[model samples]
Target: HDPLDDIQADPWALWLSGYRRAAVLVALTREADPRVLLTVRSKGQIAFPGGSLDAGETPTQAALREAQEEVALDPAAVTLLGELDDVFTPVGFHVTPVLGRIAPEALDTLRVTPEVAQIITPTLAELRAVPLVRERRTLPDGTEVPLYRYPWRGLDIWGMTARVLHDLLE
Candidate 1:
């Protein structure tokens, strides 16, 4: 089983704020082939489609809603798999990433939102071919932090987004 198979084992719960956001890494299996869908932000960053939950909405609901709002995905077409551990951002917001399985037909009908520049689906084989690496650097104040830089479409994936992805894949 994956380390994230059980959500209750998550360690960051105590630090989570009441505020919640939901993100998704949409997976699809078509003709016995699997791929992961990801979005490129209009700001030119690779990330999952997601945003803050609206008032009175559950995190799962928010995940589906945000996916549609940001990428025109249909909630009914997705099969909720499970959730990864919650992550806390440097900005003090807590985010929950939800995993789901979708049909290729659903993905074919997607309409990119203004917040999204483009959508890409990468094969798991391709992703595993490139090993992710970590680098540490010290600030002028002597504070040391680890960083990851993922190259995709001539852009560097770093910061909180990259951290979240790293934890998920690990």
Candidate 2:
């Protein structure tokens, strides 16, 4: 038998700030060697299409909604696979990562928002092949957290985003 989800075993709950925050539609291409789809936030930030939840919206709904808003993805084309463990960000958000896939035909059909400058699809093998920079971050409370960074195209991925990727890909 499988182990049931234990709220007492949840780590993010300990870090929860009694505030709302969140992400979604993390999909890979339907190619021979699939690449993860990401958005270039113009200001050198890259992340999947997602954000915080709205009133009465569940994590699944919010993730899909944010993906639609941020990357203009067609929700009909998305196939929700499952979800990852919630990642507690320093921003006081208990971020739930909703995993899913987009059809091949919809890959190039992304209609991005004004804030999104570009789309980047990097293969998982590529990310794994590169040497990631790992460091330690000291918080204001003097607590230490592991930092994971990935450098790409003169840009960078770090903080909660990197931590998510590190944990997910691990």
Candidate 3:
């Protein structure tokens, strides 16, 4: 099944009818010696460093805030690279992904908060070396689902986080 197609026909459309905010940051290290920094979520099986937008805050602000809180990196260290097209999650979140460039010096300054289990700096070369693919799964009741799976550290990075990464890389 196509992930984008599944996203379009998501059953949680009603919940998403109401306005809600979420922010995700695509933090890049360098373009020439580029490395994408990804965090293994404290609560889930995926790698992403972001969360719900706080009240009275813009998506960009929230993205920076989430990045700071989760990764212990100074928001000032990230240079805003503009925005990507918004994505609506199957769980009913209208998320805006913020693109940012972080200098190499910023990498050493990163402090992984309790919300992050580990930080992985995967180079563009490594990401390009391996083929990233999506796996489809069928539930007992005949519901179809797709997950993003990429090989890293002998593990498959899948689900929401992988989907986000896949979008950025492509």
Clashing pairs in 3: none
Model 2 residue runs over 4 Å out of place are: 1-18, 138-143
TM-score (all chains, Cα) for each model: 0.73, 0.81, 0.77
Task: Predict model 1's lDDT versus the native.
Answer: 0.62
Error of model 2, residue 57, in angstroms:
0.2
Model 3, poorest ten-residue lDDT window?
A: 9-18
Which lDDT value does model 3 have at 28?
90
Q: Which lDDT tens digits does candidate 2 get at residues 4-36? A: 112212333223211555654577767787677
* Candidate 1 global TM-score: 0.73
Model 3 agreement with the true structure over 101-156: per-residue lDDT tens digits: 99877888788877578888888678767777766665545666565667876756
Error of 2 at 3 (Å): 35
For model 3 the local lDDT of residue 48 reads 52
Q: How accurate locally is residue 117 in candidate 2, as Cα lDDT from 0 to 100? A: 88
**RMSD in Å for model 1:** 8.3
CA lDDT of each candidate?
0.62, 0.67, 0.68
lDDT, candidate 2, equals: 0.67
Candidate 1 vs candidate 3: the lDDT winner is 3
